[PDB]
Design a binder for these strands. Structure first.
Length: 176
RNA sequence: CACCGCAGAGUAGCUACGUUGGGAAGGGAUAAGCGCUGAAAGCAUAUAAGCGCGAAACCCACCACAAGAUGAGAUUUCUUUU
């Protein structure tokens, strides 16, 4: 309710259209579609007004859900989100061959990932510091899913700290 | 004839104590559990909408049988009642 009654004013340069259930947003970084079912969303030209009909414990939440989804899609395709992973540990290596990441962890093999063409991929492993991988995309959901399935290759241990973690994001540590 | 009288072997067959093979590989939906985005509840939250993983368990998959499956299927050919 409170988060749904706010405007979704557009950073002019990106358009938004509505269809029979599907809303599309076209900016400078590709079209993004979404499916709404129990909300009335209307684009005036500058702001996007999303409202509900009844307060039945479900539409009251779907209102804010779809408002936040549309706002994210906009602040995405307009600008785009980005995240940073950091490999910590001895013998850990990361390399980039375009849209193809190559990770060498303490396993008995390597891991090559053919990231989808909708996500950028940069690496910094300059001299001795921890290798930092950086992803950037307009779809925050897909970006987070890729970051999660990259982090899941090696969970951060609490004793030392070695593992694929984000920059910052202090970890829970123990004594051992 | 005497346990096939006894004793030494023995092809075919039947067996193991012998030989060969098998429980391999790959999908779907999941349990405990692990996450993405996100409100209700301006925060937070793996969930309420929607998504990604997840076991010798379940449905395929491997082998055998199977249209009396009365819901009695299909195809090719022959003859059309001595």
């Amino acid at each position: 309710s409170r988060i749904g009654k706010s405007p979704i004013v557009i950073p002019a340069g990106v358009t938004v259209e509505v269809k029979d259930g599907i809303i599309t947003v076209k900016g400078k970084k590709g079209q993004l579609v979404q499916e709404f079912s129990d909300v009335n969303v209307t684009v005036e030209g500058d702001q996007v007004l999303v409202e509900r009909s009844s307060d039945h414990k479900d539409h009251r939440a779907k209102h804010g859900l779809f408002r936040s989804l549309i706002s994210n899609m906009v602040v995405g395709v307009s600008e785009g989100f980005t995240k940073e992973l950091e490999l910590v540990g001895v013998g850990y290596r990361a390399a980039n061959q375009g849209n193809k990441l190559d990770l060498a962890l303490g396993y008995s093999h390597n891991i090559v990932l053919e990231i989808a063409p909708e996500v950028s991929l940069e690496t910094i492993s300059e001299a001795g510091a921890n290798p930092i991988v950086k992803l950037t995309s307009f779809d925050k959901q897909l970006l987070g899913q890729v970051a999660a399935k990259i982090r899941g290759f090696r969970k951060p241990e609490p004793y030392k700290g070695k593992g694929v973690k984000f920059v910052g994001e202090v970890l829970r540590r123990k004594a051992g």
